[PDB]
Amino acid sequence: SFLHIGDICSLYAEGSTNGFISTLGLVDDRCVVQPEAGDLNNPPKKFRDCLFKLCPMNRYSAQKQFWKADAVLLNKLHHAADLEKKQNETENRKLLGTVIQYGNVIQLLHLKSNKYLTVNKRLPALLEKNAMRVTLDEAGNEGSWFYIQPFYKLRSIGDSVVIGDKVVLNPVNAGQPLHASSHQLVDNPGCNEVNSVNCNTSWKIVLFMKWSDNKDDILKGGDVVRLFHAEQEKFLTCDEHRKKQHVFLRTTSATSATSSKALWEVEVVQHDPCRGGAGYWNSLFRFKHLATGHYLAAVYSLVSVPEGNDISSIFELDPTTLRGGDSLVPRNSYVRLRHLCTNTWVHSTNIPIDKEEEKPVMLKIGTSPLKEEAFAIVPVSPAEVRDLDFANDASKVLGSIAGKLEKGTITQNERRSVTKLLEDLVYFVTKPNRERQKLMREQNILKQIFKLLHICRLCYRVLRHSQQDYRKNQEYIAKQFGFMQKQIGYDVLAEDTITALLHNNRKLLEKHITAAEIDTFVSLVRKNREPRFLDYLSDLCVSMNKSIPVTQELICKAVLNPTNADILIETKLVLSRFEFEGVSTGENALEAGEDEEEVWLFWRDSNKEIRSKSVRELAQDAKEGQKEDRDILSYYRYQLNLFARMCLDRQYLAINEISGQLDVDLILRCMSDENLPYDLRASFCRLMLHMHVDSKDEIKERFAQTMEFVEEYLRDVVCQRFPFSDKEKNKLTFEVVNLARNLIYFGFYNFSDLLRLTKILLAILDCVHVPEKEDIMVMDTKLKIIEILQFILNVRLDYRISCLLCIFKREFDESNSQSSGALDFEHIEEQAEGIFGGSEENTPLDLDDHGGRTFLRVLLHLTMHDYPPLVSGALQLLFRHFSQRQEVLQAFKQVQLLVTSQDVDNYKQIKQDLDQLRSIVEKSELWVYVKEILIRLSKLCVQESASVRKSRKQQQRLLRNMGAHAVVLELLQIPYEKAEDTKMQEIMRLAHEFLQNFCAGNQQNQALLHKHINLFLNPGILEAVTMQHIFMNNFQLCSEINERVVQHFVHCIETHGRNVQYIKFLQTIVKAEGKFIKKCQDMVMAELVNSGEDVLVFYNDRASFQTLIQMMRSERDRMDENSPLMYHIHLVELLAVCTEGKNVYTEIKCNSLLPLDDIVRVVTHEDCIPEVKIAYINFLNHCYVDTEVEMKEIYTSNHMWKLFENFLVDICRACNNTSDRKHADSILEKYVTEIVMSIVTTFFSSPSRDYRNIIERLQDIVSALEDRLRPLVQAELSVLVDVLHRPELLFPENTDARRKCESGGFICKLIKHTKQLLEENEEKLCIKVLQTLREMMTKDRGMSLAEVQCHLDKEGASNLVIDLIMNASSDRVFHESILLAIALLEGGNTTIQHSFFCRLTEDKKSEKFFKVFYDRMKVAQQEIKATVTVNTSDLGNKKKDDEKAKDDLEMSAVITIMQPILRFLQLLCENHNRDLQNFLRCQNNKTNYNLVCETLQFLDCICGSTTGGLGLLGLYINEKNVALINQTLESLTEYCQGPCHENQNCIATHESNGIDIITALILNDINPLGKKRMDLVLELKNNASKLLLAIMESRHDSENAERILYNMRPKELVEVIKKAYMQGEVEFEDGENGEDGAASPRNVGHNIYILAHQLARHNKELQTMLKPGGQVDGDEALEFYAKHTAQIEIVRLDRTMEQIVFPVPSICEF
């Protein structure tokens, strides 16, 4: 039965063993067949095990000589094999869609298990009395080729026998026909086994899919996919609920890793149960829960279904999109499904399949009759498939085996296969591949192992392999731990667990063992004589918490010290034991090693813990110092002297000035050490170095010893070979180098000499010069770079340069004063007392309580003061306090810290504890809603809470606010404190500062708010304040204005209903709640009062206002009255923002009365504070109410008292009498009168020592402004010295025997693209930016496009593009600067730049996803950032006439701030303009989300409101808008400059607005005349000239209308051409030959051009057109002074691209 090769077939024995193939599981590997499973008419269930591809054998002898069996010999053997494959694979490729002849024997390989069927002649087959065994080998063998002879007399060998045939395809090698046998097995009973013999039975190929049909890209018959409710971001997911089937979408990671259940098996309808066929459109399809077996069926909801033979199950998927082509669907495609038996498009169902359990993820879902949606097929890795199944059958073997071994001795072949697994498994671990770690504990392996109740360590190795980042699995071995000792008896295998642990697993490990360690160390020191098991334990010593158990151990080791051998003399026979070991001897010299090894780790296991160690550490004896032995002893002895706590003596503008001076070198090393993880990059910064060129006493005695061993390491650096000798010398050095670094640093000193010591360090770090196995080797060099460019750094960064600063004292203006925050040294003496305060502990009873008392006060007394620079050394004082706080005294010392006057800079540093601080809020929240951790955890909480937007952002509360709100709430929802001390509201409420209102930047709050236990309700009552906490807090979580949930949210739970309880009984609750009862309760009337305010927009929406219609305002009358209101008059400006949200959106929902009067008696009955706040709430009131007019007129009989109240709130006095407290007076009148020109617009659409401090301050501002300004430029030229770059390594570093002097750039380039892998690029990235803008400047600040393209030649445009996307996190606040620099050099040479894109488009996929981002940077700048400065501007200064200008002081600094985000978007415009050229470029490739529309909508967003003559005015008349908009008209204009039909059509359309706005501005092009108007004329026109022309340079009909209809055109264009041509022609005092501007005349001329061009087609344009088209009237003969003095004509076109378009006008108009 014939079938092109690579077809897909099954095949089935008939006769006496009528059956077909069957699989052996993945652990067990043996052929068989359950005749009891199915028919040919009735196919078996488990089908995929029995189908496979039409296999041509493949040539492969090379695996086989190679497999029979310097490397070399076998390397060539194995490479032959690999190749052997290749030709097997290219050859075999040739054998595809190839009808194999019968007797064209064809290999056979096992698609599901993926294994070549194998024929084993020499090994006997067991079950047959004397046959040969048949079994699968993936790699295969030669037996594989099964002779394709045929079975029945009709067919024959050499012929492609037909479609479904018996055949006799026997192996010429097994030599037997393929034997089928009645016999059957005992372990997995279904089956009768399989092997070749001269037997008698008969199979017919039962085809599956076809040859051809094996195209991959289309989801094919039985192909994998994942069933995302994409809208629910939720692969549906049907957990077998309650030991039954639940069918349920899972808690929504669009292509991320889901657990196994996410996927499902695929089937397509075929006339035979068994062939299947090619995915297609008219084909329906049906699917099964492979994990379950049962197929989930729609009792009309998606459910489950044990057997897929019923038809209700099936579903028809209309493609989402219409196919141009053949109907075959494609893989991972997406489409809407109507369950076809149900003939009904299933709808996601909002209810849950578990629901009783709090916050549950299994969810109802089912068939929906209604038509209106689709979800993406997510095709899946067949490989991924194969692995999980191995893990299954593995599991199955493993648990089966467990049952045997626990149960009894299993048999020994069992052992073989099960080891062969065990092996095969450890083998499965074989280096980054996190998925594999998942599958196993996920696939009944992990358990099955532990189950199976050293030879044990094969599992154990399999085990600590995955060990990494895996917290939950670690506790099961508490008990098991003792076993290491008994298994340490067996082998050292169990140690690596304890250490892979130790490293990654720190902390939680520390808890359980306790003095249990004492018995595996007594056991082990008694049983490990070389004590190596013991030793892996000592290396485990990590963390401060270790030192303790460590030391008690020392006591028992004092019992253990005996050793029956000698270490002594003290000097003589140690140095002798060292010459004797110095003989490489065996036996004896052998043993010595242990001790030295033993000695080194544990002794350094000592952290910043000396004393017991500085007491253990006697004789700083160091001579035969050996491997840092000596060094850790001058290091623990250095712990005995001078925790060099910080540095940082001073601050103020000084610091920066110098850092400028350091120039790049500072970078070269900071990038050498701080990046250049890669040796290579650190190293060229070392090229920068070789260029550069130009207890004090008693510690100091140890230090002499030191200074030698360094100069010495330099005469060993005279040895260039740091071959191996540098493993030794380099290690030793290394400890000597952090410790010499650390040696200088604890022991530096303030004169020429630890510095002159640096002068030696020059020749050190220079004398310090300076693949395959070489990376492992390079590790040493690599630590030597963190430590050599740390040593280089720590001395280089802050140590370099402290005297020049104050040396230059001499003096200024007044009289010479060479140096030939007040008493900062009493506060840093009290603060070195802070260090000494570091040192102590709680047992010094004498010292512990008494003396230090509370220095907090100086802290408290100097909090307002500019920070001392050693606050990082003040943060020192903090960190210890992480341990505990039983003693109450905590707080008082602990509070000084809360006293701070610089939160942001610190809070960044304070985030340090974020993990530990989140424990301070989880323990602190375990005891809140000793006291200093809940209160200090809240005082922490607010400092960060009152911070930058990036800071709220840094709450980043996936790790873990759902745990700090959900664990905070797990205890603090039931727990609340009555007024007036209470604090759940605080560590929770500081957090929701989402820019201090409104309802934005709180996206993270639906999911943490989403899994929760609600707050109390109904009868009885609960405790104060945290219900209050509760309500304002609910606002901030569900107040995002962008999603429809907020309505269901401000409703879900509390709903409309809340109102009726805020009528009464909360006063009862608050009176029992506190002494100031009224407080929790006027708080509760605010909380009742504010469901409007937060996402007031997102409250109403599609439909929340209609729901409460007729109830809530009628009810709002009920709480209409109050007083004493200070707090509840905050509930009256919160009942007044509350009260401001009532009538805004009620366009169409009113049938009630008297609401305006209530507020009106309220605002008057007011007493207490100055109206300014209640006259801005009452005034804001009168503007919102006066604006609506005719609706307000329907609402009541009259509002006459509201014009006198509006005129008395608007009229007032100096406060309303004489307060005299404001001074930006033209701002206020000003905005108020174009918000009253705005309001005017709204009404028709109606329906001895301090002198040291100060003269120092002054010489610092004068020398400051002088020095800093002048100096930066020459540094920019010397920066430009690196810009020789390629020529610089050739000068001097002239690089002989071909060394690579030129072209240094391209390499450094890739290097830094990798360096930003560090989350902090910091100034480093920015420092790069500066020089690029100065590389435009080799052509400028002094060819530049061979430099622009030179980079682009030597790694260019590509690296920087690929790099611009990290600007999200790193670089948001330089992404602006970054952008500018990139555009400059490139601009003017898009030749270069095409290459850029030319390289870019390639990564088609890797390019395509990325396109959306900038658009949401604009877009994301776009809609918000219009709102921000634009409308406050719109109220434009001062809309009152002209002949104390008081123009608001300092408006410009501010506007510069608001358009910082805007300005990002803006330079963005200029560059978009500069790079563009070819159309493909302009085309915005088939990206994910590439809508030029966003340009039209940000363009359209400050525009926004401006239908007529343009009267944002203010915002129009506002300046930053203009640069932005013109370059958006030149970017936008280079985009339409290509006049793509679909671009011009697209633009006016998708903005649907931007366009029209463009039209209306020029028809009142500015009302404010002047220099600002003049520019408004040139841009308003030349940008409009160019752009309008570009969009209109085409012929269709559809693209012209959307724009012409915008203008009263003939009259707007002809009265604007007579008012602009007239306003413009009349003066004629302009500058001549203005290459530069011609404004009103090449612009107005551009209107004559526009009018001109519209005359291709239509009739309304002939209508505008006959007034140029004729006449003798003056304005049509001025309009004739154009047609003759405008060109009024168009040029001859050969037609570009493909002989296409016709014409457009070219200026030539004398």
Instruction: Give the separation between CA 1534 and CA 544, rounded to whole angstroms.
Output: 63
Closest alpha carbon to 1651 in 1640, 1631, 1665: 1665
Q: Before 1339, cis peptide (omega within 30)?
A: no
Answer yes or no: is 490 a known binding residue: no
Instruction: Give the separation between CA 948 and CA 977, rounded to whole angstroms.
Output: 30
Identity at 88, one-letter amino acid code: N
The DSSP secondary-structure symbol of 134 reads: E
Identity at 1312, one-letter amino acid code: K
Closest alpha carbon to 1230 in 1067, 1395, 1433: 1433
Q: Which residues sit opposite 235 in a β-bridge?
A: 228
Instruction: Give the separation between CA 1566 and CA 1510, rounded to whole angstroms.
Output: 7
Structure tokens at 1193: 């007129």
Structure tokens at 1094: 């937060």
Provide the b/e sequence for 833-869 (b: ≥16 CB within 10 Å). Answer: ebbebbeeeeeeeeeeeeebeebbebbeebbeeebbb
Phi-psi region of 1699 (alpha: psi -120 to 50; beta: other; left: phi over 0): left
Contact in structure between 1283 and 1333 (CB atoms under 8 Å): no
Question: What CA–CA distances, in Å, run from 779 to 559, 713, 719, 731?
Answer: 40, 19, 20, 11
H/E segment holding residue 109: strand 108-110
The CA-CA-CA angle for residues 1185, 1187, 1190, to 5°, reads 85
Burial class (CB in 10 A: 0-12, 13-18, 19+), 493: buried
Answer yes or no: is 1603 a known binding residue: no
Handedness of CA 1600, 1606, 1612, 1616 (dihedral sign): negative
Place of tokens 């290396």: 539
Contact in structure between 28 and 393 (CB atoms under 8 Å): yes
SS3 192: strand
- Rg (the chain; Cα; Å): 41
Question: What CA–CA distances, in Å, run from 708 to 178, 705, 711, 740, 1600?
Answer: 83, 6, 5, 12, 87
Handedness of CA 470, 475, 479, 481 (dihedral sign): positive
Question: What CA–CA distances, in Å, run from 1199 to 828, 1043, 1206?
Answer: 68, 37, 10
- Tell me the technique behind this structure: X-ray
Contact in structure between 1330 and 1338 (CB atoms under 8 Å): no
Closest alpha carbon to 1331 in 1369, 1259, 1277: 1277
Burial class (CB in 10 A: 0-12, 13-18, 19+), 671: buried
Identity at 271, one-letter amino acid code: H
Alpha helices in 505-587 (DSSP H): 508-512, 517-527, 532-540, 547-560, 572-581
Strand pairing of 315-319 and 52-54? unpaired
Answer yes or no: is 1507 a known binding residue: no
Answer yes or no: is 1205 a known binding residue: no
Q: Cβ contacts of residue 471 below 8 Å, gap of 6+?
A: 508
Question: What CA–CA distances, in Å, run from 862 to 853, 1550, 1663?
Answer: 18, 59, 80
Instruction: Give the separation between CA 1000 and CA 1039, rounded to whole angstroms.
Output: 7
Contact in structure between 1453 and 1248 (CB atoms under 8 Å): no
Closest alpha carbon to 928 in 881, 878, 986: 986
Instruction: Give the separation between CA 729 and CA 1277, rounded to whole angstroms.
Output: 42
Contact in structure between 983 and 935 (CB atoms under 8 Å): yes
User: What percent of the chain is helix, strand and coil (3-state, nearest 5)?
Assistant: 50, 5, 45
Phi-psi region of 1025 (alpha: psi -120 to 50; beta: other; left: phi over 0): left
Contact in structure between 670 and 681 (CB atoms under 8 Å): no
Contact in structure between 170 and 147 (CB atoms under 8 Å): yes
Contact in structure between 556 and 526 (CB atoms under 8 Å): no
Contact in structure between 1595 and 1656 (CB atoms under 8 Å): yes
Q: Cβ of 944: how many Cβ atoms within 10 Å? A: 24
Place of tokens 């952002």: 953
218-380: CATH topology is Trefoil (Acidic Fibroblast Growth Factor, subunit A) (2.80.10)
- Which class in CATH covers the domain with range 8-56+95-207? mainly beta
Instruction: Give the separation between CA 25 and CA 10, rounded to whole angstroms.
Output: 18
Q: Before 71, cis peptide (omega within 30)?
A: yes
Structure tokens at 1403: 């990564």
Closest alpha carbon to 1243 in 1197, 1295, 1280, 1191: 1191
Structure tokens at 57: 């054998």
* Residue ranges per structural domain of the chain: 8-56+95-207, 218-380, 654-807, 1270-1402, 1609-1628+1636-1710
SS3 206: strand
Answer yes or no: is 471 a known binding residue: yes
Place of tokens 């009620």: 1146
Answer yes or no: is 650 a known binding residue: yes
Structure tokens at 160: 């492609």
Phi-psi region of 1221 (alpha: psi -120 to 50; beta: other; left: phi over 0): alpha
Q: Cβ contacts of residue 561 below 8 Å, gap of 6+?
A: none
The CA-CA-CA angle for residues 1342, 1348, 1349, to 5°, reads 145
Handedness of CA 1520, 1526, 1529, 1530 (dihedral sign): negative
Answer yes or no: is 529 a known binding residue: no
SS3 1479: helix
Contact in structure between 989 and 1021 (CB atoms under 8 Å): no
Instruction: Give the separation between CA 1518 and CA 1526, rounded to whole angstroms.
Output: 13
Closest alpha carbon to 1368 in 1410, 1408, 1409: 1410
Same fold, 8-56+95-207 and 218-380: yes
Structure tokens at 1404: 């088609």
Residue 1671: phi and psi, rounded to 5, are 115, 160
Q: Cβ of 1403: how many Cβ atoms within 10 Å? A: 13
Q: Before 980, cis peptide (omega within 30)?
A: yes
Q: Cβ contacts of residue 1654 below 8 Å, gap of 6+?
A: 1592, 1600, 1604, 1661, 1664, 1665
Contact in structure between 48 and 20 (CB atoms under 8 Å): no
The DSSP secondary-structure symbol of 166 reads: B
Answer yes or no: is 922 a known binding residue: yes
SS3 887: coil
Question: What CA–CA distances, in Å, run from 1578 to 385, 1603, 1625, 1637?
Answer: 66, 21, 14, 7
The 3-class secondary structure across 138-154, one letter per residue, is CCCCCCCCECCCECCCC
Structure tokens at 978: 């009555």
The DSSP secondary-structure symbol of 856 reads: H
Closest alpha carbon to 513 in 459, 474, 555: 474
Closest alpha carbon to 557 in 625, 616, 512: 616
Answer yes or no: is 925 a known binding residue: yes
Identity at 1605, one-letter amino acid code: L
Q: Before 770, cis peptide (omega within 30)?
A: yes
